[PDB]
Amino acid sequence: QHLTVATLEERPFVIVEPADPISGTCIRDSVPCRSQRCCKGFCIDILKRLAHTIGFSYDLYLVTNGKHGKKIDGVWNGMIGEVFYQRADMAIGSLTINEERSEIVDFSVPFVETGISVMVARGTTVSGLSDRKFQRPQEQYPPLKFGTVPNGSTEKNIRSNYPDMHSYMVRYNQPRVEEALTQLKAGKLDAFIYDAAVLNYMARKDEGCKLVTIGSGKVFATTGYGIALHKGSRWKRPIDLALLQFLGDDEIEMLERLWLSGIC
Ligand SMILES: N[C@H](CCC(=O)O)C(=O)O
């Protein structure tokens, strides 16, 4: 009846703000979340609906041990680690389903479609991730500068499928999306390769609409965000049924409009 839920800030899917200074409570659509503050956003609204529909209470906390999830020398960190090591009953956020993670935790059915996209300044001109500027990176006279934020499903995918390109990207690793966008707009990066759902949102919200996304096309695989649960969790089925209901009730579509819209 009571679940411990791990999450991670990644706007606009999870947004963290201080409590209302006047009341000292989380107001509006926000809910209390502690650190491993008030949380809101697309995924938090999903969590609120799951809790109401299925009928559980929860304790929400922000992950400080890494981010989404990476395995290093046999040990998982991030949201995936919290679930795998059974510190949390579930993790919800902008958490990407991939093969490696699916082996060790169960995922809900996907509730947001994602993958990998490439962001560049509208001025800049490359074809896409197929472009040899990316693929044969150290062939270009002034090298192309492209990076990702390391440790997530994007870097995992690139290292596994395009190890040459990955090796070239390492020096351009960015600490978070905000800095990457800054470097891209300053021309310190030529492209930023990252989660599609997030990148496409950032493109839509860009002050002045100067940042644009290119589809990765055939280069990378589509996937989705899923809620992570203990392998064999009894919670998977009721979570899935609820999510499926939300999808067909246009509740998810409504939340997309609410949280992920932009003018660009
Ligand atoms: N959703 C993030 C992907 C971030 C990225 O593009 O690396 C994850 O679960 O790892």
153 annotated binding-site participant: yes
Please, which residues have CB within 8 angstroms of residue 126's CB and are 6 or more apart in sequence?
Answer: 120, 133, 134, 144, 190, 191, 214
Full 3-state SS string of 128-145: CCCCHHHHCHHHCCCCCC
Look at the chain and count its residues.
Answer: 264
Same-domain check for residues 31 and 91: yes
Same-domain check for residues 165 and 247: no
Ligand 1 center to 85 CA (angstroms): 20
Ligand 1 pocket, residue 152 CB under 6 Å: yes
Same-domain check for residues 73 and 119: no
Ligand 1 center to 116 CA (angstroms): 9
The ligand 1 atom at the shortest distance from the C-alpha of residue 193 is: 6
> What is the rounded distance in angstroms from the CA atom of residue 11 to the CA atom of residue 14?
5
The ligand 1 atom at the shortest distance from the C-alpha of residue 195 is: 6
Nearest by Cα to 4 from 72, 61, 52: 61
Same-domain check for residues 19 and 34: yes
The CA-atom distances, in angstroms, between 225 and each of 6, 27, 131, 164, 200 are 15, 27, 28, 27, 15
Q: Which method resolved this structure?
A: X-ray
Domain that holds residue 149: 114-226
Same-domain check for residues 216 and 234: no
> What is the rounded distance in angstroms from the CA atom of residue 64 to the CA atom of residue 131?
37
Same-domain check for residues 11 and 59: yes
Looking only at the bridges linking them, the beta strands covering 90-91 and 2-7 are parallel
CATH code of the domain containing 218:
3.40.190.10
Same-domain check for residues 129 and 215: yes
Full 3-state SS string of 66-108: CCCCCEECCEECHHHHHHHCCCCCEECCCCECCHHHHHHCEEC
DSSP codes joined into one string, the chain: -EEEEEE--BTTTBEEEPPPTTTSS--TT-EE-EE--EEESHHHHHHHHHIIIII-EEEEEE--SSSS--EETTEE-HHHHHHHTTSSSEE-SS-B--HHHHHHSEEPPPSEEE-EEEEEESS-----TTSHHHHSGGGSSS---EE--TTSHHHHHHHHH-HHHHHHHGGG--SSHHHHHHHHHTTS-SEEEEEHHHHHHHHHH-TTS-EEEEE-TTSS--EEE--EE-TT-TTHHHHHHHHHHHHHTTHHHHHHHHHH----
Looking only at the bridges linking them, the beta strands covering 191-195 and 146-147 are parallel
Q: Which of 96, 192, 202, 225 to mutate to test ligand 1, by most ligand atoms within 8 A of the CB atom?
A: 96
> What is the rounded distance in angstroms from the CA atom of residue 236 to the CA atom of residue 232?
8
136 annotated binding-site participant: no
Ligand 1 pocket, residue 68 CB under 6 Å: yes
154 annotated binding-site participant: yes
Same-domain check for residues 4 and 100: yes
Same-domain check for residues 19 and 79: yes
117 annotated binding-site participant: no
Ligand 1 pocket, residue 154 CB under 6 Å: yes
Ligand 1 center to 95 CA (angstroms): 6
> What is the rounded distance in angstroms from the CA atom of residue 201 to the CA atom of residue 199?
5
For helices 251-260 and 196-205, angle between their N-to-C axes, nearest 10 degrees: 50
Ligand 1 center to 96 CA (angstroms): 6
Ramachandran angles phi, psi of 112, nearest 5°:
-140, 135
> What is the rounded distance in angstroms from the CA atom of residue 212 to the CA atom of residue 130?
17
Looking only at the bridges linking them, the beta strands covering 116-121 and 211-215 are antiparallel
Q: How many structural domains comprise the chain?
A: 2
> What is the rounded distance in angstroms from the CA atom of residue 230 to the CA atom of residue 154?
23
Give this entry's resolution in angstroms. 1.9
Same-domain check for residues 86 and 145: no
Ligand 1 center to 24 CA (angstroms): 33
130 annotated binding-site participant: no
Q: Which of 70, 77, 94 to mutate to test ligand 1, by most ligand atoms within 8 A of the CB atom?
A: 94
DSSP codes joined into one string, 153-170: HHHHHHHHH-HHHHHHHG
Same-domain check for residues 119 and 173: yes
- The gap from C-alpha 78 to its chain's centroid, in whole angstroms, comes to 12
Here the tokens at position 129 are: 């991730």
Same-domain check for residues 119 and 221: yes
148 annotated binding-site participant: no
